[PDB]
Amino acid sequence: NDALNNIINNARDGCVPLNIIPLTTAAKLMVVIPDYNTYKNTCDGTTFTYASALWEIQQVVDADSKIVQLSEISMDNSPNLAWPLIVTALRAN
Amino acid sequence: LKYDFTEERLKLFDRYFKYWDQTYHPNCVNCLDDRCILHCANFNVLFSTVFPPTSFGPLVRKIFVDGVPFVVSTGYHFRELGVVHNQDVNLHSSRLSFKELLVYAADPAMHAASGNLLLDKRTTCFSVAALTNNVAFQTVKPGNFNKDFYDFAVSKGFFKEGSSVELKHFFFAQDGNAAISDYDYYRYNLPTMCDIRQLLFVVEVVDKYFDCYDGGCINANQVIVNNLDKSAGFPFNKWGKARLYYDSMSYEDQDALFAYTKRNVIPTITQMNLKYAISAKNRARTVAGVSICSTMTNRQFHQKLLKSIAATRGATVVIGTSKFYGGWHNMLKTVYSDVENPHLMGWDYPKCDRAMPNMLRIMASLVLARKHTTCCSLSHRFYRLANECAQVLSEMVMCGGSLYVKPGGTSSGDATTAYANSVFNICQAVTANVNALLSTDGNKIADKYVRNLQHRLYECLYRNRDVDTDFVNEFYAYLRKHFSMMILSDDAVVCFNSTYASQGLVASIKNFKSVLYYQNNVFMSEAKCWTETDLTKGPHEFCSQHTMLVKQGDDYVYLPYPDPSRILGAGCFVDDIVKTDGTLMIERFVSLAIDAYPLTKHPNQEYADVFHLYLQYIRKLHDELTGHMLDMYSVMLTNNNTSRYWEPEFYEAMYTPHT
Amino acid sequence: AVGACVLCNSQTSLRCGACIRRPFLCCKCCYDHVISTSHKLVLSVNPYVCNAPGCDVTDVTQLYLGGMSYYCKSHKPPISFPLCANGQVFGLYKNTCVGSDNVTDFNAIATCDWTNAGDYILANTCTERLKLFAAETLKATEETFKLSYGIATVREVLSDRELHLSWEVGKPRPPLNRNYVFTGYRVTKNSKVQIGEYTFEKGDYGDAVVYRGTTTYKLNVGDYFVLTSHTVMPLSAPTLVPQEHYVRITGLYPTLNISDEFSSNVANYQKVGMQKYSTLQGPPGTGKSHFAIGLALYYPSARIVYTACSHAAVDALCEKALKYLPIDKCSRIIPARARVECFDKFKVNSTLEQYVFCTVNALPETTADIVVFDEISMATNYDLSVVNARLRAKHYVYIGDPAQLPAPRTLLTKGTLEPEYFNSVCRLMKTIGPDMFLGTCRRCPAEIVDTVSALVYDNKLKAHKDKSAQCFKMFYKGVITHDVSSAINRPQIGVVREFLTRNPAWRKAVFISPYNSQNAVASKILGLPTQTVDSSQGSEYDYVIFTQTTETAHSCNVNRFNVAITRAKVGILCIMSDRDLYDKLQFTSLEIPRRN
Amino acid sequence: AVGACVLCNSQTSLRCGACIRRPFLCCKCCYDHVISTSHKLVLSVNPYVCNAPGCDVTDVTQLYLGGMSYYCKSHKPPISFPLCANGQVFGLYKNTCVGSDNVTDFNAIATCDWTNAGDYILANTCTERLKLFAAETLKATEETFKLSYGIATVREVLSDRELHLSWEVGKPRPPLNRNYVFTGYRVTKNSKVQIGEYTFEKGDYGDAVVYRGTTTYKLNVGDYFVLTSHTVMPLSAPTLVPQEHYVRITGLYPTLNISDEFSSNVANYQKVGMQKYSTLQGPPGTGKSHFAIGLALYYPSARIVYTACSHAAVDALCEKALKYLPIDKCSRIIPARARVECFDKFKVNSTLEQYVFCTVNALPETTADIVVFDEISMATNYDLSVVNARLRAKHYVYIGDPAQLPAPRTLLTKGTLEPEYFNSVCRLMKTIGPDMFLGTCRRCPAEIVDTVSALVYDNKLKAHKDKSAQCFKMFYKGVITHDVSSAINRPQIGVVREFLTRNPAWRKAVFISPYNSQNAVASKILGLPTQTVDSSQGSEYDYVIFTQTTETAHSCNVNRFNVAITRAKVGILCIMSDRDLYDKLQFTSLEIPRRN
RNA sequence: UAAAAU
RNA sequence: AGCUGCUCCCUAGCAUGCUACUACCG
């Protein structure tokens, strides 16, 4: 992507620390969640923010790698799932 | 984007440490000797706690080859070493030979940047990236059971209720949240600033402990790799084991590569793996497989010294020395030497491999390297040290399907573990001695000689700034005369004078306690430190063996007998075909019995019964084997010569000084 | 490479390589098979020949193991052992094998060529494992014989699919049938290159022949076609799982009062769940099929699989099921085969549906609650073991009529089989008892029922519904226009023309023929969609037409005649020259100018 | 490292290092090549050299197998035996080697110089493996002859197209050709950095040359230009797949009836689907390309590739093509090269639209249903096999007339190559026909084709609107006053001095001449633009004045002349000595001292 | 001389 | 799916060494 080249050109030298490359320039984020309260305190709702950017949720799976919808993620339905979920979100503009 | 941060460190230094009369170098590259490297990396440890943790690690850069853009690392920002730039980078090339293919494959840069962003809440460890669209979970299947042997052991009266020996070691299973929930244990690793002045002398004493060896660079055609088939780290495990690689390279590719690391830096990627073996505590155990690229060099750089250590007797280190043929007795005798009121003691470091602060790891690498006085230059040695640290200290662990950063601690399975841990152990011991000695009412010590010793010790430690040799030698002699240490890779035994230890002239145990506390961030309950007053019975335990004084003919010898439950367990639980129908595996039991011989000479009963049990079982095994083989064909074998295996004497030979 | 003795199940490592199928044999058994038969070459972990180059003494009884290796009489080492020694042959576990007395009939099996019912009559009455081996070698001999047919080449091309072919002079020419396939080779010099698979069928005249191809390749003149052979897998499952009972019904669950139209059969429904398996004999397709589907309904949640051998059979069955079942149904039937089309409804491959229909040879390898084989009066013990191997369920039900049509098993040409000996369950029905029976027609006009009960049955049926419009013009058989020995008689259609038009509404009937090619020619001067008597046995129709070839043995077969005429509901007509049967049939024959 | 013999295809591990390409020779074949030629060095997994240091003897015939090494006669250890014996050489699989006796022509190729016709004549007349080897070889020879060039020194940087580039001394300067694409470097001091590529050509005057760069990086007086060089890759696919015929089209979906103005083309279009590939004979601008686009229309639901080698050709093709095509198109040619601008339509890299348009060395490993290539009169067998290697479509098609001009193949010095052997498919089209002749013309006037079909063609192509004033002012050539090597025909241009003003309405022409310095000295005595055959291929100037050079065939190169005719809309003047050629271009015969 | 195979 | 260290067992191969008897010369 051109934005990578861009942030390269912003370097006073052309060398940048590795850790911040994917943080700013990735096109898709994956988050691993253990427990329900924790989920509530992060990607609750259909979109959220992280790392000064806006991410939108789409497609959520479980430990058994089966799809699950956001509806089921209640407080008391939670003891019915392979419960360290994987959430894949997209870079929203 | 900012990653330099130099005059910031200098500004901090000036605002606080204004009169610390010694030049500070924000980048160890500009250090003089090594002691300057220590005295600078120390301050760096403290200062690096301030800056963003998303600004350490590899320092990548865009390059071109054959009119094509790549991203490769050209340097590093060590939270203890400052900035380091690779010295031989080449923009714009036409093609790629083999070594460069390799060094661009074993790097995280191109891997990471081609990954999707990861944020996990399972661990407080700073995650980095993921390479797939689905994290993986690995389990640990349960062991397989060998019945007929169990029924046998029952039939001959074992395992009855209230018996002394019973089953305690087994094959614990592990579910799916094992790898990560284990790896998380690095949360016990903290940035700790170790006292520098006393370190600058304990390192001298430790060095003195290693005078009688020799090492240096060696040419590729001289390395020795026992067992050429082990996993090849990441991602080389996508092709084959080591032999494939150790073959496709010339004897110069190795030399070219080695001489290339002596001026540039190569990040790596470590893998975690779940050990699958019997144990006694359900918490799983794991191992770190390192990339081929680091080993292939660290070998050439250390193997000379290593082999120099693995073949010397009577040394304070005891690695490689075999216990058979009475050797164990030699060890226990020499560790007695001549201490005036000998007591024995041992201890153990809780989570020794995680809790090790980075400073001591660097200290160990320095002490090892100090032998290279000539097989290198002096910037070469520093770049070597840098590549080492970057490969086995803050490298990117590849757990599950994701890359995290390892804040510190020893990588469980590098090239130089066992020796490094031992060096660390000796360092801790010496530190405890120094602390205890300084920390006593100097006006109450009676032996005038010791009082002068303590005085001049403090003097040489805080006042004088340059190394003294004579006092170092005198002190080393004093320690070898009143603290005698047999060391292994963290596992120790100390024979020390009691009278002095009472008057706080050598470290007791509470000294060890305070030391681990204030220099290792952990606490060692005296529930595992063992003491011992009567030498006639050997040390309480060492490498998981007990010691017993048995009359072997005319005289008395120390012998190591293991823990019976362990042996029984090894008899009863295995991995499928193994042992199950063990009528093809006798050698297993041969060796096992070998390990369980000394239980014959034991005061308590059931012990020797274990031995006789193994014997009779071997006999029944071979018998019912021949019976089947006869029917299979129609004529038994011509000459088995296996009967010797079930006569006791042959085992006895494995413990007598003549081979 | 060991196993069990086909006669003693003892451990061994031998196979009578001289016998075709290489069966495992105990020591003593091997000694006896070899001493009493031209069968001599024994194979073990290695072959048994003299290892000295040149010596080819392969009669094992002459050979000697030398040092590790085997040797003749002459080239023997100074020290050795005689192999065929002491009423036994040396093999692994020699001192353990027991041996027994089934050797005579064994060699009888292995030595027959399936030419006379006797070797059959024994094939169906030996021990089960032996029965298996028998079926194996039978099918193998069939395949091997199939190779004996000639080769075909192209002579000149006529159209896209019209062609003139050239046969091997002096070789058996196999028939034009959808059950034959030919690999096409053309040769450059060099470059004997396969071109594809091609079936055949007779065009409108000789020797214009049509062909269906695998790809759109252009044809040439230096081309030829080899009928493609086949292999045969070995089997290991028994024919019949050991019969059992229980004290109470398990696994399956009735409803309550649903569908009383299936009333009386509930009695049978319980006892079916009460056994491990059972059989049912019934005159054509009456309670047969009807009862099967009724039971299927009875236990709703029961996962059920139907299967048979005849494609048209399973097709008629699946449509009858469609008549009454949730859909919620599939017939996972045919992959890249189905030369004749069949099922039209659902998938061919997911094995999720509760009510799965398919053909035996195309079955998957799956489990279910119960399974209902059908038309056992046609299958061979081979197929029975096949289905018991591929599938695995609790309750089995086999259905058929030992008066129907068995497997052709063409190879036999001397004598005839008693139906009792078609296969195992055939015996079971004919021997002890069919466990459950049904005796009434719900499908056929009463008059033909009377005729049949007067014939092959012992006047033991009843039904409903009588008239009309039935005849049996004993029209002399015109020219047997037999293309191959497969029969055709065009002047037989020479009166169909007189009912190709006189037919007021007999326009949607089905025509039936003793032979396939006379059936094809019926499709030529078309009247309607026709079929073969074998491809029948599964469906009924209001009107049906029937013309016959000559009075050949295949034709005048009473069973073929019965199962043919028993496929009609209200109208029927059959035309044989007929010296006797029209004396047995009860209709109203006419004369060529008398057709109303 | 191991492979099949280039002649007998035997699995072998030998390479004649004395052969430039190091091919794989079987044991026997290697023995023959070495005993026959001066190729006296053979490589296996290792070279065959006396391993005794200092003894630089290399050939096999004096080398002896050492204990585990190789040694000369003098240096051979006691037990040491030579390598080459029994007509065979010590090599792997030496048991199964077969060899062959065709070492003759193979040798001739391993020794030819590629400077003369007979080399190439043999080349396009041998076996496939030998053909590919010949292509590899001649291309490598051209590569090293290119390497014979050198760098240069920049005098000044005049303009973005005007540049001052003196060539390094002691080196044959690379002339003014688009082919001379040079890797430019801006020497910091330091900095072996390629600033891009820049190629050069003769503009409207010298010695200020014109240069185009793939990047507009402005040069200065300090740069230096190396000749871009690399290594030829070996090839695997044959020149062409064997042709296949079909009784129908394979997966082609013909259009119903859209844009039937290409109707005479659809009669041909379906033919494509019947043949694995085919060929096409046609003048450019005719159904040339037009046919291909109408074809892509005729099957509008199919992946199609269009390829050429010249970017001028891919622009002449891709434009006119996007016309009748949705856009919605693909012609994604150059990622990061192309000395000049190229495709302008979409994306570079995702093989999207069913119709792609690119150049040979840009075609990646992609697939289609049909691949099409014009320009066949120009590419090499090397190029054909490259095409086959990069594409795996289900159909292929070849367009072009050998009447045009082929690859430069500079090494030709003694003799000329016939279109008869330009390459394989061309050798066929000229030895068996294109199987499709294409007509007719479109742009040019009739009079420039009605007489020009009397030369290469057989009065075959037709056009109309013959006007205006297309004549041959055949002027007997003057003396030879050539400034550089190529001819200065200023007396020949002395026919237009009295005519630059006699044409007030024809002040819109363009000078042409074969020798490029005949373009140069005309550009000196210029008043109207110039354009030679070189940068042609897909354009037309309204007026043009053909100016001939020396009577040598360089002037009336009937191919070069013809193509110089075919690129016109209105008028032309032809001025040559011309004893016989003018009897084929029939116009108003005009003279020069007379103005009629 | 009748059915009819990842 | 690691880094070492010790130990047993099996197999091959090389070379030595040694033994002797069998063959050539002294």
Add this chain to the structure above:
RNA sequence: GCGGUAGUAGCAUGCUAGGGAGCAG
């Protein structure tokens, strides 16, 4: 009848390589 050069088979040592298994950190 001895000494030196050629065989045999045997024995001893060792060294390499290859393969299996177990224990300690």
